[PDB]
Amino acid sequence: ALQYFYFLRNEKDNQGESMFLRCVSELVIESREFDMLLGKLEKDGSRKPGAIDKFTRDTKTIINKVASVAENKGLFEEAAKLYDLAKNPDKVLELTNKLLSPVVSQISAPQSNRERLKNMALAIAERYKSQGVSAEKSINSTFYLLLDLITFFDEYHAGHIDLSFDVIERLKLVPLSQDSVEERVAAFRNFSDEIRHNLSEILLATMNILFTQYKRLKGSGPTTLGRPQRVQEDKDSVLRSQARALITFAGMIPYRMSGDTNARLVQMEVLMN
């Protein structure tokens, strides 16, 4: 079919668009034979040429038009691979951040969109690390922060409360002390929208972690003859101080959280007092 459309190489429509470009764009989308027609990226990020590279030197304009038609049809994974083939790392991580953002806090289910998008992002991350490919520092920092947040929510949903706490402490996204609140509110202004959209769920998960550690401390009845009572009172005071820092932070951020989120944060603190 591509041999026949090459006769249209000099033909233009009434708008001046190339008829060859149009027919090839329809052909690639209908056949779904992207790697064969348009070529594929290797692990080094060299492009293996497709069938179309025989006919034109401007394969990049073709791949971008096909990618835009795939995006408009809702084929976002294929559109991301095609924009990447259009030699755009920056675009890969930008689109992957947009795709990961709504699924970060979700519970992992077998065959879920979250698990598929996570596995896609991990495969991109492993390959870009092995090839030494870096996008723009802003986009790249957002991408790895979304991956670390997926790990935080995996450990949280697995019930590994102490490991999920160590991850959120390392990420420095939320204040774990009253003194850190102003610094973190200032830092919040520099986060991307993809991270800001997840902040309500991060605060709820972090507050649930603190509340569950507090319940474990109170439910450990007095039957271990040998732990000094002062170390328990000090740890209770610290968890309540951390919980207060999260609420003070949630109230100071220039971001309108859901009314249910703020109500649940305050309700968990009242149950810790």
Q: Do 188 and 172 meet the contact criterion of CB atoms below 8 Å apart?
A: no
267 binds another protein (CB under 8 A): yes
CA gap 98, 83 in Å, rounded: 15
Among 132-140, 153-161, 211-219, 258-266, the segment contacting another protein (CB under 8 A): 258-266
CA gap 132, 153 in Å, rounded: 28
231 binds another protein (CB under 8 A): no
263 binds another protein (CB under 8 A): yes
264 binds another protein (CB under 8 A): yes
244 binds another protein (CB under 8 A): no
C-alpha closest to that of 249 among 234, 261, 235: 261
Q: Which is nearer to another protein, 172 or 215 (CB)?
A: 215
Please, what is the minimum distance in Å from the beta carbon of residue 103 to another protein? 19
Q: Which is nearer to another protein, 113 or 258 (CB)?
A: 258
CA gap 71, 74 in Å, rounded: 5
Q: Which is nearer to another protein, 224 or 273 (CB)?
A: 273
Q: Which residues contact 34 (CB under 8 A, 6 or more apart)?
A: 28, 66, 78, 81, 82
| Run of H or E including 179 | none
Among 126-134, 161-169, 209-217, 256-264, the segment contacting another protein (CB under 8 A): 256-264
Contacts to another protein by CB under 8 A: 258-260, 263-264, 266-267, 269-271, 273
